[PDB]
Structure formats: C-alpha cells, structure tokens
C-alpha cells in the first residue's frame, strides 16, 4: 500500500523470479558500484557479482518467502529484509536472510547492495 | 580492513553495548527520520524507537554476534547485516537477524534504518 512498500515488494518478487528461473539475467538489476556479500564472501562490483551468481552450483533452486519488510530511507532509497526458506534441487530445505538496498538511478530501480545468509532457523 | 567495515563494525559494537546496558541511551544513535521495524511492527523517529526498545519487558539483555557484514553504498552510507544470539533474563536463548543503514549526519554516524527479527527457535 505505501509507495515504498509496493516498489520494494515488486522488486523482491522480480529478483526471486529471476534468481529461480533465469539468474544470468540478474545483472540487469545491478549497476557497476553494486555490492554482493554471499554467505560471508564479498563480491564488490557488478562483474564480480554477475560471475558469482552465475557460478552457483544450483541446477534448480526455489525461494519461498516467509516474511518481507521495507523502509524508505533519508536519501529516497528503499532498504528491505527478507526471510524464508530455499530448496535447491533435491533438498534439505534451508532458512535464509537476505538484505537489499534499492535506489532509483537514471530513472529505474536497481539494487546497489545485496547480502545473503543461510540459516538453520525458521521464521 | 575496508573503511566501511571498520566504521560499521564499530557502530555495531557501540549499538549492542548500549542495548545491553542501558537501552534508554540509544537515542544518541537515532535521528528523527529514523525507521525501526521490530518483528514486523513499524516505528518512526528517535523518541518512538527508544520508547519501543525501552518498553521491552526485560531486565538483563545480552547480544552475542555470530557474524556481521558491511558494505558501502553510493550515497556514502554503510549498510550492515548482523546475525547472532539474544539472551533476555530467563527466556531460552533466541537467534536474531538485524539490518542497519548508517550515514554521517551533523558529524556523527547514526542509524537511519534498523530492521530486526527473531528466529522461531527450537532446541
């Protein structure tokens, strides 16, 4: 309902659609200065991100969202928190926490910061 | 090593130190435009946020960080992800996930965005 909630919600939706069905198209939502920290490893810069995301051994991965929250920022960006479970091929379901900072740059929404962590938790 | 990590790690240490000794002092790291989402609930501004955290029904609170990640943002903000364990008085230990967005305002690194969730724990 709130404008930042609708945008952030839509972005997350788009991000997981791409990640679970066409991840080599993910780079389209990043920019040169975007950063990715996947399970502790830092991939600063789009090239590194695109490379890392494409090297994931996932043959078939599926994200299931338990909860998501968004907040507008002083500089008009949107920060988001996402929790839920992921299923890669033939299992053991896992929990995950993903953080995103979105910005409108050149009149388009992109993700400048992305942080993902696996978790033995549930929400 | 990177400056955003040094600053972020430092802020994180100070934040949890304040939370675990006298959370009514957290007003110093929040500003009026700050947003807090705690277990899905929203609160805006220093006063409401400090009120919300202070209202937590705990005498003794203890945070233990298992991992923290930090990245710089295009607007010179620092975004962070924190995961660890939370211990409140006699409740069983509970894992937590938190996100912070930091920025230097009026010569001080403050948190404009704070997002927190507890993992439905077992064991």
Swiss-Prot record, chains A, B:
Changing residue 63 to A: Loss of interaction with GDP-bound RAN. No effect on interaction with nucleoporins. Decreased proteins nuclear import. It is found in: Cytoplasm, Cytosol; Nucleus outer membrane; Nucleus, Nuclear pore complex; Nucleus inner membrane. SUPFAM superfamilies: NTF2-like. PANTHER family: NUCLEAR TRANSPORT FACTOR 2. The keyword Acetylation applies. The gene is Nutf2. Changing residue 16 to A: Loss of interaction with GDP-bound RAN. Loss of GDP-bound RAN nuclear import. Keywords: Acetylation, Cytoplasm, Membrane, mRNA transport, Nuclear pore complex, Nucleus, Protein transport, Translocation, Transport. InterPro entries: NTF2, NTF2-like_dom_sf, NTF2_dom, Nuclear_transport_factor_2_euk. It comes from Rattus norvegicus. Changing residue 39 to K: Loss of interaction with GDP-bound RAN. No effect on interaction with nucleoporins. Loss of GDP-bound RAN and other proteins nuclear import. It holds the Pfam family NTF2. This is Nuclear transport factor 2. One of its GO terms (molecular function) is identical protein binding.
């Amino acid at each position: 309902k709130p404008i930042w909630e609708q945008i952030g919600s839509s972005f997350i939706n788009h991000y997981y659609q791409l990640f679970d069905n066409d991840r080599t198209q993910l780079g389209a939502i990043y920019i040169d200065a975007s950063c990715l920290t996947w399970e502790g490893q830092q991939f600063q810069g789009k090239a590194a991100i695109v490379e890392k995301l494409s090297s994931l051994p996932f043959q078939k991965i599926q994200h299931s969202i338990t909860a998501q929250d968004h907040q507008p920022t002083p500089d008009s960006c949107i920060i988001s928190m996402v929790v839920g479970q992921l299923k890669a091929d033939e299992d053991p379901i896992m929990g995950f926490h993903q953080e995103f900072l979105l910005k409108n740059i050149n009149d388009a929404w992109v993700c400048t910061n992305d942080m993902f962590r696996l978790a033995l938790h549930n929400f």
